[model samples]
Target: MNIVVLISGNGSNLQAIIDACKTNKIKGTVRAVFSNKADAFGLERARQAGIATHTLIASAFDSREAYDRELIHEIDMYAPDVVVLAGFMRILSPAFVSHYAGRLLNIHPSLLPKYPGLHTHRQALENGDEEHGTSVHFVTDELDGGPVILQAKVPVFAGDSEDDITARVQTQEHAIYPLVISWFADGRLKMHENAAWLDGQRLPPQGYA
Candidate 1:
């Protein structure tokens, strides 16, 4: 399968996927890496791996929709089977979301349906939750609202600061995001009506072990 990874910043998660692909743990080619910022480190990561890369400045566009249109055009040119949002910060317009629909995936730094947006670790700490984690799910029109493929849980320490908890959760994100993407590329995972089914069986809430 051909895949394109999107990112806007550090690209640690993007590195995870690239490493997984290089090591043969994932069976897919990273067709390209696209970014909204010219200086995004993810683009360099892709270049180092000898993969194609593209950068479009969203700021140059007058409207979000126009930006989305150009972004979608670039992605479509690659003819990727899947588009992974490793750390892309852009909130896609509905039209763009529909264009990709079931083909889009994102890794969020929270066990979603809990903290759907930013500062998830801080949110968990503020709520006094005992557990925090990361999730890999489809990207829908509703932000972070999609069928979850896999999640990794971690115990929130009693005195954990937001940074501490986030750092820990990110460790799990790097570990699981690639695995989930591998499942998608290999056809071992499928999404239907906001739920995931693996290998023709309805996935349990926790997914495959």
Candidate 2:
């Protein structure tokens, strides 16, 4: 599979995917890593891995649509089979989402349908839940509202701080994200009629446990 990863920050998850590819766990090559920030540390990680990298400063564009248009043009240069948004922070435009509809994927910090945007770890703590988790899903027009494909539930222990739970959930993210990418690489995972499919079975709304 020819994979393209997008990121905006530290990209620990991006590194996870890179490591997975190196170890033959993901069964694909990372064709390039793209970022809106020129200083994203993920670019350094990409360089260390000998992968191609590109950056487009979002502020240089006049509008969101303008930036996304350029982003689409640059990403298309790679002709990716799958686009992975590991830590990409942009609120993507519909054109961008529709352009890659069935091929776009993202990993979120909280089990979706619970926390849709930022501060997900804090959201779980504020809700006083007994458990919190992470999710992998297709990237639709909705912000983190796409169809979930994988989730890993983690316990919320007594006196656990937000950072504590974040660490726990990130561990799961690293594991499941690559597994889903591998499935895509193997042609066993896909989006059909706006829902996720795995091994020829339609996944539940929450996807695999």
Top lDDT prediction, candidate number: 2
Candidate 2: misplaced stretches above 4 Å?
Answer: none
For residues 1-209, could you state the per-residue lDDT of candidate 2 as single tens digits?
A: 79999999788899999899999998898999999888899999999999998998987999999999999999999999999998898899999999998999999888878899999999899889998999999999989999999999999988999889999998999899999999999999989967899989999999983
CA lDDT, every model vs. true structure: 0.86, 0.92
116-206 in candidate 1: lDDT tens per residue?
9998888899999999998888888888878777889999988789889988988998898888888888888877867788788877655
Could you tell me every candidate's TM-score relative to the true structure?
Answer: 0.94, 0.97
For model 1 the TM-score comes to 0.94
> Candidate 2 has which clashing residue pairs, if any?
none
Off by over 4 Å in 1: 204-209
lDDT of 1 at 159: 79
In model 2, the worst 10-residue window by lDDT is: 190-199
Rate residue 71 of model 2 by lDDT. Answer: 91
